[model samples]
Target: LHSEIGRLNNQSLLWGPYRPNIYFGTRPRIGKSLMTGLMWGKIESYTDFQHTVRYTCEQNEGMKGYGWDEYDPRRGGIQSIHDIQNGLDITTSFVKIPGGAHGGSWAARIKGTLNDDAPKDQKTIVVFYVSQEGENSELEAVPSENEFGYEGDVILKGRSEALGNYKLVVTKGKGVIPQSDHDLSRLRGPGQTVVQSLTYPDEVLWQAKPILFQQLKAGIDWLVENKYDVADPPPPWQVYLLANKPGSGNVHIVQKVFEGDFEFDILFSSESAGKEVTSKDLEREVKQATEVFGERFARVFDLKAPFQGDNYKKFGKSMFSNLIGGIGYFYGHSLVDRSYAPEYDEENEGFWEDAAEARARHQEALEGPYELFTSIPSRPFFPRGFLWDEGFHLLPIADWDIDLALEIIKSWYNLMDEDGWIAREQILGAEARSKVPKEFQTQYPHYANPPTLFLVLDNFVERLRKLDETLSTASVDNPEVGLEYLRRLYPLLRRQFDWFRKTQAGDIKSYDREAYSTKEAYRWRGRTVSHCLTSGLDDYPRPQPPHPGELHVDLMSWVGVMVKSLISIGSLLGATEDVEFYTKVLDAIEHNLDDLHWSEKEGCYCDATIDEFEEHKLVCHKGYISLFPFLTGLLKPDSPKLGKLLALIGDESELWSPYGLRSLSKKDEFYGTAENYWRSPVWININYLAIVQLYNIATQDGPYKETARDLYTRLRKNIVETVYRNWEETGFAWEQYNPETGKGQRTQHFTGWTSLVVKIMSGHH
Candidate 1:
């Protein structure tokens, strides 16, 4: 087990800026390992000096834009930060050398360029710090023979269980500590080696910005208290610098003051690995990686006419780069209620009310400090793993790097409990918890997000099939790797499917309804009067009052999708019994989708609920939920329902718009009302799925092939154009798009699923 885990870890995710919340940070995948972060501030702006310091990425900063321009998860990437307010455009290029007992070695070149509007003498304080977290870690500064205090090459050596013995070298750059009037009387002179070693609580280790500012403020205050004469009243940058203290602490910082255009390299080399890497090596590696990435991206995505230009290719690279760059490794405990809580199996009339009351009683307790390796939705707003969002994130990733995608998938499955439940939103540890609201911190095991992972797994199976057929007589690239991964992953997938079927099963027996399948229907739990958060379409009008006998169309459709994937996977792995069983489940789900949820009068699928008379009724919302059956590929191209579904999708007055398919129909009473999320906005994830299925139907010999092809073409162009235009304007990919204006809105830097534009533009699916 250890050998397998170690091999995978070393290959894919040994070192990265796993802490995506920060502007630039690096750490190995191991929990509580040695971490490094970069912080900077324009010290010249004394009035707003404290606010100038930037470490963490915040939405309120109002920077023009900041994200990875070119990135490959296995190698390295280049990140560009446009700090318009600070008059600085920063470039952070990181590259890794693969070899060693530990996670090999890596290097980052940080460069800052002043804008044309900046003052000629603008001085900036850039601090690069290496800090240790938890126990069994040590870090200390190595004294160098330099006349200036903290101005020359700053070297730090450290050792930890995960990193082994490593040395960090911050190559000296231009600029020096300004000499003060009372420098003659001071104990330390300017340009001498200065290092600060301080202890901080483990909880606040990730909070580098505030802590560094606090320390700088304290140091400034001490200088003033001593009545030290300085050129300016601020006592210069030398005052904040402390003499070299060669001991280990929770945090150790190496400070540098730079003026005008400046560049420096932070080289980290593992002693147990190969020889130390230099800045020159980093430059060569970056060039080679960039060339390879461009070639591979072109071959994989195969962008067409309009998107074949250099600018579009650059934009595509940025979008895809940021998506992978957003991957984070988090370790911490979660708030869970494992005790005999009634919320999980609540089936009473007012179960939501009871669940709310139970939540008020605070029965939730902290579970194990589990570890999770996953991608985030947004760096600023949602720098944590979201189960549903991850599936969409992996779609584009898998097309680029199958191994990395598999590694992340395995990591997620590793988090599954014995009951096959993984938290929908992973708010691990104190640092991760800090970004989330208190109400959303606790996760209920019973609640389920859309089983979108199955969709990704299904894609993988298809890829494997294609590879096998294409390479039957050619040199096959490690076919055993894919087979072995699926072989190990099959059991877990079966357990999860079984758990979903049992736990989320709807009340088919209780409700007196005639259907093709009696036990195949399902409903999303954790429903309120106006919301079904577990459905991942929060506030997409479900049945009011939250009836116990309600059957969700989308949930049933999702089950059909899952069963389809299982059948394919089981067949590939030669699990005959499982394949046969899943095939039966799929058959029942397909039959019930039409019998139980199809609303002939409404011309779309709808949710079934028992009314006051306790009779089965179709509750039509006419939105994404209405299209789930078709969206999940359950509907045949030649089916009678296909024309109406196609009409609904194509009609401008309904779901179709100039931008893309809106979440809720424009004519619905709840459209663009109440939180307005997943109500009227155009989300890229669902639209991507719609296009994929549309293209599938278009290619096949069916009655509606022409209509499906037309809809698919228009929708694909609409989504890709909107995302591209918005990205050009805002310098960030957004969470959702405004259906009417076609403008990006909500969480900025939401490259998670929004990056699917790369796939759409490439015509990959």
Candidate 2:
């Protein structure tokens, strides 16, 4: 199905409510208007207007994984852990901490950053709306070209595909698909639960016949007839609890959670639950027996798994530890030997190319050129250092000792779902694992995992074929099946990739600038800036900034996988023309990289855009991700640019981090502890890319050996120790740890990334 161009999510801003109002009354005990998209205002006042949008993506790649649902029998069931009672929550006068926060129990799903001063953008949330029954009253009118007209008739609409109850949550994030990380659907154990239908984004926008001025004008007209005003008093967010209940609690009797008791005589129509309960009244009840039914609200609204206790320990131990051990075996690879950081001949060190020659002898490993010195010698539970430190670890083990690497890969494949999209982790037991601030984890939609599954699978397949050709026969069966699987996985990756773009990168099509989300949406707008985070869409530093070259890097990685899969599939299908097309796409992508990414003088690649060149730009900082074009061999390492990258990393004062590797280069102002969050350091998936590529590029007889040795050693150590530390300290494998201490950060534990570390370490070992 094709969508109309320019009509999907074109608007590039996420919005918040303007001077929000609250109301409380009978029949419709709740009324709220959510402010989303582009809103003109800051938090200080509803009148101060400034064009603002947060987390806006501009690519078609940015459109999946936004919301949830319940069941399906045909394609297996939901992937999320819970099988029932999961959906959206929208209400006016919901419990919040002092200001405009949606503080209901449902608020637990998001990590909202609240700035007491500004209410407009202080919330952190993904844009979602439940169909039907939004006690939250209105949506701001968005006319063409940044105008909210008074009486002009306008035709405005949005994608309805997103319209759903916002209430029913379907799949819980399973770290490593309870069974096979390579298969996206295996996690759906079949009791075939339920599914609540939701209106896709397009459906919601068109069905919405809501108009602002008409309602306001009509309200005032009625008041004029009655010699009074209606819409002039207060906004929808400021309603006070009734002193006396004029109506019954048909469904929403608990709208008075934050209200005070009556201080004066209260009136009642006697048509509803007209009982009067005051603070003093409750006080007496408290003195006697505090258990009396106050407003008759539920004792509590809780998920089956609150994930409040030490849930991390469970998955970290059971799923993560076991999964990685198995994946290393399956991939048939592992880092084995290393030269403990070459004791360089300090005296003979020469300048430039000469110095590059001095350390040349060390680069001479014949079997696996990537056998660089690594810290990972494998002590006990796993190796040490960065999570991806074991990239080199997956070597000889696949060929020399195929059993180990295959074991690990098999473990990961064990976690896959039927969809073929791999989960971020291979966790198990009853633990909840994830990232975002500790508080944010409360709102985390998925578990703590990254996007290295496809890449990992790529290596797994390669090594498996290399280990024993017969295994390839079984796995591939036919080129057609292999190609189909690869192509199917590609879209899944694209969908996930796009989710990041849409929400964090602001890639919506024709987004309305005036729509306000429930308090949840408003808060998320604030987090976009405050959080400066992402989903590690590429599988590293989930919160890394939007550096210039990162998009291309993601595309490159996506394409690299496609190039191979498409070739095989095309051959099987016998569509000779298809092969030519994909090959061209690959070539074009490479050309674009060379044309744009190459920066000669700096000795390192930086982001390039046609609009203007930005130097020392922070969004998507220069790092291993930037090296993608070259390291992948698409851009040969022998190229001058590649030498520059070596120079950059060799310069200890810059990109290198003793713990693992700083997320941002050390010289940048943002570079700091991974736990610091914004521009934080320590990512494993990144180092993995570096290890794989450097090995692929340099020859053992070359001058790149000394550095290769150090790189491999450091990476191995980082990966192994990280896993052990997470396990030893908290008994769980986690996403990111304070690289400085190897301790889990915030409320994260039992994360998929942690499990990834194990698999890599075991394979390398």
Candidate 3:
């Protein structure tokens, strides 16, 4: 990660020095591993986009000194490859077949810098390629990654002519390419040729010239030079990193933890203010935060709050009941997507559990009503319910404990804003908007969350009255708290329903039908939206052009969610108008969902739409969310539409992933790691929703049970391995990991979603 650098601001592009050009060195893209023949730089280096690719090629024993080798039929063969980035060394190497048609392997060699032509003291620089010793015939080529990973063209015949092109990038280093002396064993035939750049078929990303020693110095100086320039402000980019540098050991780590410049962020807001109350004082100057926020500051760190008193499972019980108490955990994540695999076994592990538990063990130095949490202290661990996440979260929690579920619903309902809206996030004590960077906000305005609130709250109310005399004689008690919350909620839901109805489902077809439609929300035409990785909605648009509507199937699905929530409310309250109101709303939801979005030929749901079939075409993906029939029980597995989802959400290639299923499948042509936002992040919320839906199906008989069970079993496997990777690396779950290789990625490490250990063991869901 440190090796790659992105130029966010100044709107300029600078290429690396002396990039090495190479081609596939293995078979069927399996043997593909090549490096810089131009090892020009001394390697005090650095780097960092989007591309879908495949590889294949092999060499005669003669090509050993270069970066390839052949598969001797007499020996063995290798296929398929995977890797992970570790500091700079990387947990990577070539996969090799030991004997003829036998076993394969890829090993990790030493990580060092190239001093010169010869490798230095075991301080290794690079293993040019995974060169096998024995020989074989000319390599068959693997087409680019587009060919379903099929190996395309032959890279070399005997080793003279080059095959495909391999571009090397070393941002900060003296230009260098060690001399490659191996005789050519295989060369591409007269018709074959190596091309530059690797973006797409017919597209080349090689415009970047290689960097030289001067350039590296220039880049570093550029950072120092431009840190304060207002000319073309560096694009708004932020980096948060933590690392265990070699040689530091645990001692330095402990010192850094308690006595150094590190300060843990416990972002919660109750209200009013204290000496170090503001988030500004907590995050602005790291050192200053340590001085003011102090050890006590972490008490509000929702991540570490639950287990501070020695009961690691308190937070778990409060959220999903102590079903998984034994796991011990720590947790953090956005209200939008769930990250941790909620159904992991105590022994299995889903992700951040242990880290959360460790955080819980820390002692607190401060306690107060300072207001980061909902002032009443209910579910204090929850950072006050955000707009839509409460519903998704409650899905499994409600299954575990109905009482706690109702309490949360009542707690949140009471906090509604006057406009029948709630702050996207209601951290009662958060720093005001004008006082800090907007990114830190939990959400203070029209920034609504996903719409699952009504669905869950209505469930709570239904279960409350249905309890009958068996549970308690004091049924329907006019408890002032619950009543007030409901009163506030009724008006809020009324307004929220009106908002959704008036916009697309109820109003003129074209205006704001789907998100970002009309003249209001379009962004620069060519720029892609983050996460989903399409070009449309702008994160922050300016002199913003006339709008093209933002597209997201979830947006439409949310409409369905809202209708369901209101319907549930009507049934429980017995309001005549609510019944009629919900009935019509339900008709609209079905009308849009089945009659409008579902495509019989494609057998997939489109991601967005406001104008029936007029807009929201099938261009956006229908991978993860395609299973809404299973997600909402609108259709049985046997239902005609439900049948299509089996193949849709089935494969990792299309939908499934090692990490919680990817938000977008890796196979999508637009899918790639270079695109950071949608590079392929997974949300725990997706996992939770998917699993509950599957459980809802699996426990019952359905035509999709086989499919449901298949996924449920896979879900278990994902949980086991996900936790294993976590334990092997550190003691926590992270924001997400690379789904393709199961190797950890992004955020290096984050403390979100790992808190389900208690739920896992507690039999919560």
RMSD of each: 3.0, 24.1, 25.7
Candidate 2 lDDT by residue in tens digits, 101-143: 1211111112122223333222111222122223332222122
- In candidate 1, the residue pairs with backbone N, CA or C atoms under 3 Å apart (3 or more residues apart, or in different chains) clash, namely 148-191, 148-192, 149-190, 149-191, 149-192, 150-192
Between prediction 2 and prediction 3, the one with superior TM-score is 3
TM-score, each model?
A: 0.95, 0.37, 0.44
Q: Give candidate 3 regions above 4 Å deviation.
A: 1-385, 390-411, 427-445, 458-462, 465-488, 503-551, 608-616, 673-675, 747-765
Per-residue error for 198 in candidate 2, Å, reads 30
Per-residue C-alpha lDDT of model 1 across residues 636-745, encoded as one tens digit per residue = 77898978998999989999999999999998999999899988999999999999999998899988999988998898889988998988887889899999999988
- Relative to the true structure, how large is the alpha-carbon lDDT of every model? 0.81, 0.30, 0.34
Q: Tell me the lDDT of model 1 at 384.
A: 89
* TM-score between model 1 and native: 0.95
Please give the lDDT score at residue 660 for candidate 2: 60
What 10-residue stretch in candidate 1 is worst by lDDT?
A: 467-476
Q: What would the per-residue lDDT of candidate 3 be over residues 106-153, giving only the tens digit for each residue?
A: 111111222233333211122121121112212222223321111122
